[PDB]
Symmetry: D2
Amino acid sequence: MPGQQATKHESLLDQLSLKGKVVVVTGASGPKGMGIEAARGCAEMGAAVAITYASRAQGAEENVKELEKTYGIKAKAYKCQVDSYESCEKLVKDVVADFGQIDAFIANAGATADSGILDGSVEAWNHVVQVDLNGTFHCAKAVGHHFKERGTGSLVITASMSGHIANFPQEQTSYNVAKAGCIHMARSLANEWRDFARVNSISPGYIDTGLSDFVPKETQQLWHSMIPMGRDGLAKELKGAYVYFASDASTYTTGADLLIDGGYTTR
Amino acid sequence: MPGQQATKHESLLDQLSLKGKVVVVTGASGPKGMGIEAARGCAEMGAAVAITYASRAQGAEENVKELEKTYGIKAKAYKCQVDSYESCEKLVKDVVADFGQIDAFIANAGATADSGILDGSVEAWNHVVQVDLNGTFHCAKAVGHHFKERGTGSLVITASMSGHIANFPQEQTSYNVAKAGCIHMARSLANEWRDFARVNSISPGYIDTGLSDFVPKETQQLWHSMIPMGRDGLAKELKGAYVYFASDASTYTTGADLLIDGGYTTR
Amino acid sequence: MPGQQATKHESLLDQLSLKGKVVVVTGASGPKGMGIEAARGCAEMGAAVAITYASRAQGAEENVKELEKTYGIKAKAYKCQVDSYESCEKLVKDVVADFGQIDAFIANAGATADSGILDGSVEAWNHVVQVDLNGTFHCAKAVGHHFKERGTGSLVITASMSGHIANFPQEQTSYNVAKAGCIHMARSLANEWRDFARVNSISPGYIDTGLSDFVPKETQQLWHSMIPMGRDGLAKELKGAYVYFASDASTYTTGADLLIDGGYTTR
Amino acid sequence: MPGQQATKHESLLDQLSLKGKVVVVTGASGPKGMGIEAARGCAEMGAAVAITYASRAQGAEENVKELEKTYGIKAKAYKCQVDSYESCEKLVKDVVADFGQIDAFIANAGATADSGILDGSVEAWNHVVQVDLNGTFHCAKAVGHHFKERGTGSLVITASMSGHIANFPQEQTSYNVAKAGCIHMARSLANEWRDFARVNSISPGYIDTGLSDFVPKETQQLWHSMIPMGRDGLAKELKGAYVYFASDASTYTTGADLLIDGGYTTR
Ligand SMILES: [Zn+2]
Ligand SMILES: [Zn+2]
Ligand SMILES: [Zn+2]
Ligand SMILES: [Zn+2]
């Protein structure tokens, strides 16, 4: 296929449609999160979804049942540990052999950091870099070969506003550094796969996935004052961007980054 | 307080739906320009569109008919010269009087340059900055007052990759400077309107709007070889991004920028 | 085409030297402002300096005197209205007449904004843009013609961190937008003038030039908490960067921006 | 923890003076490399210098000798492999024992890639990221603990324009991604160390250090055409920036990045 061409559909609803297409999402281990929302969004567009999980399948199992019943499409859960290449490589092979192909890939690897560079050990640093950065690298290289053989494809990497600025007052340089590298990874791969696939990243700000309770009320109040919209976001506010990049509504966008932080980076 | 809240919808389709909402597009007036595509994408989502033209009206009148028969929505053409604040103030006052209110405004100040600031005159500069920068300011300020009075709103300014980088073959700093100011104006206003409205921008690259012949067939050759995707972009590949920022599919994203240059700003 | 070559000096001290060279600074009008500090530094490196003033002859004249007796170099003040292209074209003409040339030009003209685009009038907006954006453009175009004729030059425009983010809580979009245009103006001109001159920008964060009394004590504290260094900057903390860009100590750096904001933009 | 205060000096020369200060450069071990240039510049300002090497002990030994003889300062070489934290931790230890302190640390990791993600193996990726990314982390973490104890310091990390864009001819995503992380590491640490030290980065473009023969001639012309200055930079054009960040001529700069690429990123 001589390079990537523009959508054949003049209709937005046909550009966004994922019918006849296969999309795979990483996290989606719980009925509440960025990965499950991306899964629901793509599914709503008639997409056959393939969500993965790290340790326990319970969460994925149900997400699939909920995905097939409410959207009436085909779905399946797979075990995948991004920190391991062979794991990712296995994911692709198994998803391709099951669904027959992979059209879009949503990668959301986000292991947090609990300290600064000095207070933290080396192990602490490597954990974040190995999962957040290298983990993204693993998924990309896994689907990359499949995209090259089909001459089509869309890789959406989930980065973070932490890849733009440094969070305060919590210190998490390792996370920021990993996420920043993730953003540029999108740019560089877009240029590398310029002949067959599109690559773009989403940089979420403070999105409440359901764990706010494990955070000091004062800390949250301190964050909201820094967020011009003065509130946390909800994962369902990302599905749009997720579907946008995965579908044919962005056949000319590649190497881009979309900020969704309620205007945080703006200040 | 309250102010700037998340979508009430979980369904992506519902978040994208513009039924019941009024969106105005300034560019729209040509056959395949960025403006008519935005109105097309918005109209397809069930929105009542108000498009504007600068001089001749034959084009926007025809577009209004097109929009009404292919999407069954109400639309009307208005004469507006972004360079004049009164024209924009009248534009807003008129649409609201004809449609009830404005839910989303898409600015599209498109005036190009033809030289550097040295070869060009002071007039040449004032032209670009007045139409592309101040003009966008006029539209923004004009609808902002409405948005504030209502307590809601979404402003989508059409910037350009030229606000990120400087096109090589041809010199056009005045245009580039104007567009960059446009990009930050979106982040700056997202923060000023953080209590009632969102503001975001799109930075298009080389999009073929139907003026291929008015550009040296030899200058384009260079472009085609400098764009990773190796081809011009199509206005129909921008409707997705326009609808995204105009609809409720992005209630937590404000002050962000979306590049659509086929990977050009990647190298 | 003369083309831009690397400094012929190996020694840093020699690269920083500005002996046998002429420099012009537009701010130098007060005791401890960014302008006068920019001049003192250049004069220290042994350079003839031309400073300008908007209408404060007394102050500038005092600056000229102190500059000579302390640096043993030639100095002279001129009246310049950056908002007027003729004023700038004149400034250059005069300087080239008295000093015989201009090797480096430091653009500095701050026209603070007193409100957001909604509270301010179109006039207010136009003034800030005319002085801050178009003003810088006027100095660039004025001196550019001279650099092109000499095949050598170095422009250093003083932007602001405000061109990167939006100050809080004070609203000043007109000021931020202008400064934003100033930053990309440096990038665009660096390319436009590539064959004969360098262009770069400095983005000052909160610097105290002796006017802190105009800002409420309560607002000063809010700012300091937002500055990781937790303090205001001093004009003398920018002279190194000004001299850095004005001298041969940066003959390969063009189209770059240097933030001196105590880390304010980091968050 | 005396807080980072403004330089006490008013003179730029005093500010730039590193007499009584110790600096350490990791690259320095060759004739005209970026590292040795950084050493030379600091040596010329009157600083005690310590350079490291990974294997070329001979070259380092001679640089020391040459350093002490022309500048009359104390210099010594140390073996240090940045990919090992223990080696870095030991570097800081020994230097602080021999020199008594460390005021400025210039980090540098030159490991390069020779293929993209798909062609390269997981090992090739890991190697670059470990040396380039984690290596810079190692250095930072090592000196950081010392800076904190002294309540003063300045870290300068050598990144690359590859952290901002993706090189066209060659495919080197691992390098690009790694360099990108370095840039943000500087921002992040600037904030984390906001109480005792300053952190900043330099992003070089095509800088010919000598190996301008191992590259095909036709390849050189292609790059040179993408560089506004149309030439490769020389290592001696970076000593200005290295000394700028390491000295008291930038006591308010932190979290800033400086591009020195002949305007390459401008386009
Ligand atoms: Zn472990
Ligand atoms: Zn005119
Ligand atoms: Zn570029
Ligand atoms: Zn910020």
